[PDB]
Design a protein around this ligand. Structure first.
Ligand SMILES: COC(=O)[C@@H]1C[C@@H](OS(N)(=O)=O)CN1S(=O)(=O)[C@@H]1O[C@@H](COC(C)=O)[C@@H](O)[C@@H](O)[C@H]1O
Ligand SMILES: [Zn+2]
Length: 257
């Protein structure tokens, strides 16, 4: 089944997941001149001080850092959101080259990678119930460009050797995701979807305007990961991004003038 190759990639997904051609699919191009400032947007609240990371996993599509979401330890509130959304995991999408890798684009510009911090709406009790709801998830998206190193990313980078292939995991406790944020929390927001199968239309997207910088050495280590399992022919984990989808009947709102 699905992946990012020529024969199982994004242009094939609709055959197993017809919602791929739905009315609120992600990612999208963010046209900065068409996005409208919305003064009704409340300030974004990112409360990660009590975040409890557990594990990092290569699942054959990306690497995922998982959190304890059995209590309100790390939460996202405010902005366009009603209620409390619990951090469950984060992951990245990245390219084979610095000129591509992000899922969202900004005036058609592609960044080298994109970080997704996934949160679920606690009024639905668990993640599996939340993805069945139009306001079930809030994903915080952060662009990566190549320049100076991101110190808060390095602990992630240095563990990747231990999870090279699909199915491998490692202990990843006491990681502080606050070290992955840019200075500004200015954002764009729109209603959208998961960007991987099952492509469910359950996400409030919050995409930060300010990218973070990571070093060429850091993103090079992303690209040494493997889509395949151990003892299988090596396929480098690169270009695990879905391209921009039609905006259709949606307006992207900006938190800033
Ligand atoms: C809690 O886990 C999740 O939310 C993942 C990531 C999230 O991606 S994103 N691009 O839309 O923010 C999708 N879901 S998911 O539907 O639960 C999760 O994701 C997939 C791949 O996703 C990645 C990035 O590796 C699959 O393997 C899949 O079986 C799904 O259950
Ligand atoms: Zn993602």
């Amino acid at each position: 089944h699905w992946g990012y190759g020529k024969h199982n990639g994004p242009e094939h997904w609709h055959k197993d997941f017809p919602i791929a051609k739905g009315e609120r699919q992600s990612p999208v191009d963010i046209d900065t001149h068409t996005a409208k400032y919305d003064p009704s947007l409340k300030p974004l609240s990112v409360s990660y001080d009590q975040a409890t990371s557990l594990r990092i996993l290569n699942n054959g599509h990306a690497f995922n850092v998982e959190f304890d979401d059995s209590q309100d330890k790390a939460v996202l509130k405010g902005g366009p959101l009603d209620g409390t959304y619990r951090l469950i995991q984060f992951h990245f999408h990245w390219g084979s080259l610095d000129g591509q890798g992000s899922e969202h684009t900004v005036d058609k510009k592609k960044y080298a990678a994109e970080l997704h911090l996934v949160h679920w709406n606690t009024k639905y009790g668990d993640f599996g119930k939340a993805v069945q709801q139009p306001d079930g998830l809030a994903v915080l998206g952060i662009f990566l460009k190549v320049g100076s190193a991101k110190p808060g990313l390095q602990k992630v980078v240095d563990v990747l050797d231990s999870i090279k292939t699909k199915g491998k995991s490692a202990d990843f406790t006491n990681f502080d995701p606050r070290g992955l944020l840019p200075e500004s929390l200015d954002y764009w927001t729109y209603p959208g979807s998961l960007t991987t199968p099952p492509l469910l239309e359950c996400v409030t997207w919050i995409v930060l305007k300010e990218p973070i910088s990571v070093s060429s050495e850091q993103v090079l280590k992303f690209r040494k990961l493997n889509f395949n399992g151990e003892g299988e022919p090596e396929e480098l984990m690169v270009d695990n991004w879905r391209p921009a989808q039609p905006l259709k009947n949606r307006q992207i709102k900006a938190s800033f003038k």
